[PDB]
Motif scaffolding. Structure first.
Motif, PDB file in Angstrom:
ATOM      1  N   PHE B  25     -79.084  38.326 -56.759  1.00 38.38           N
ATOM      2  CA  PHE B  25     -79.367  39.660 -57.260  1.00 38.38           C
ATOM      3  C   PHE B  25     -80.499  39.595 -58.269  1.00 38.38           C
ATOM      4  O   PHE B  25     -80.475  38.772 -59.188  1.00 38.38           O
ATOM      5  N   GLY B  26     -81.484  40.467 -58.090  1.00 38.76           N
ATOM      6  CA  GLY B  26     -82.540  40.583 -59.063  1.00 38.76           C
ATOM      7  C   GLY B  26     -83.360  39.310 -59.159  1.00 38.76           C
ATOM      8  O   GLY B  26     -83.398  38.474 -58.259  1.00 38.76           O
ATOM      9  N   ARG B  27     -84.025  39.180 -60.305  1.00 43.94           N
ATOM     10  CA  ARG B  27     -84.878  38.035 -60.552  1.00 43.94           C
ATOM     11  C   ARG B  27     -84.582  37.399 -61.901  1.00 43.94           C
ATOM     12  O   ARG B  27     -84.082  38.068 -62.814  1.00 43.94           O
ATOM     13  N   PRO B  28     -84.878  36.110 -62.056  1.00 39.73           N
ATOM     14  CA  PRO B  28     -84.642  35.455 -63.345  1.00 39.73           C
ATOM     15  C   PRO B  28     -85.475  36.081 -64.454  1.00 39.73           C
ATOM     16  O   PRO B  28     -86.595  36.545 -64.230  1.00 39.73           O
ATOM     17  N   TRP B  29     -84.919  36.089 -65.661  1.00 43.11           N
ATOM     18  CA  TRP B  29     -85.691  36.497 -66.821  1.00 43.11           C
ATOM     19  C   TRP B  29     -86.643  35.396 -67.275  1.00 43.11           C
ATOM     20  O   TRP B  29     -86.534  34.231 -66.887  1.00 43.11           O
ATOM     21  N   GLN B  30     -87.590  35.798 -68.116  1.00 41.56           N
ATOM     22  CA  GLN B  30     -88.411  34.906 -68.913  1.00 41.56           C
ATOM     23  C   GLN B  30     -88.003  35.059 -70.374  1.00 41.56           C
ATOM     24  O   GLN B  30     -87.160  35.889 -70.722  1.00 41.56           O
ATOM     25  N   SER B  31     -88.607  34.246 -71.234  1.00 45.28           N
ATOM     26  CA  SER B  31     -88.327  34.353 -72.659  1.00 45.28           C
ATOM     27  C   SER B  31     -88.729  35.729 -73.173  1.00 45.28           C
ATOM     28  O   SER B  31     -89.820  36.227 -72.883  1.00 45.28           O
ATOM     29  N   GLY B  32     -87.834  36.346 -73.944  1.00 44.74           N
ATOM     30  CA  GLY B  32     -88.076  37.654 -74.510  1.00 44.74           C
ATOM     31  C   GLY B  32     -87.705  38.816 -73.616  1.00 44.74           C
ATOM     32  O   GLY B  32     -87.797  39.968 -74.057  1.00 44.74           O
ATOM     33  N   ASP B  33     -87.287  38.556 -72.382  1.00 42.98           N
ATOM     34  CA  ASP B  33     -86.937  39.636 -71.473  1.00 42.98           C
ATOM     35  C   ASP B  33     -85.641  40.307 -71.908  1.00 42.98           C
ATOM     36  O   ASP B  33     -84.713  39.658 -72.402  1.00 42.98           O
TER      37      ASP B  33
END
Lengths: 40, 49
Positions: B25-33
């Motif tokens: 599901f969805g996509r991985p976050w990055q830093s600060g997301d």
């Protein structure tokens, strides 16, 4: 306004459906392309 | 969290939704997301942004 015309008109909706089915338009590709384009 | 029926969660390390197991599901976050969790109990739905 366009959506209102669409909801009101019977012919408009059916021709939309006919166009889509004959032309094999995905529409789910257009809506979900961002995730798909990104291929994650 | 999410392995059992007691939680509906999103994991952005892999892009997964967890409830009684994992599903993509969805996509991985990055830093600060920032993940916005929304719950509608009139339509009985859970939404993640």
């Amino acid at each position: 306004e366009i959506f209102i015309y669409w909801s009101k008109s019977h012919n408009f909706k059916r021709e939309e459906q006919n166009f889509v089915v004959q032309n094999e338009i995905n529409n789910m590709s257009f809506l979900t392309a961002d995730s798909k384009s990104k291929m994650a | 969290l999410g392995a059992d029926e007691l939680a509906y969660v999103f994991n952005g390390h892999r892009g997964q939704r967890w409830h009684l197991g994992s599903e993509p599901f969805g996509r991985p976050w990055q830093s600060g997301d920032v993940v916005g969790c929304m719950i509608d109990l009139t339509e009985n739905t859970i939404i993640f942004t």
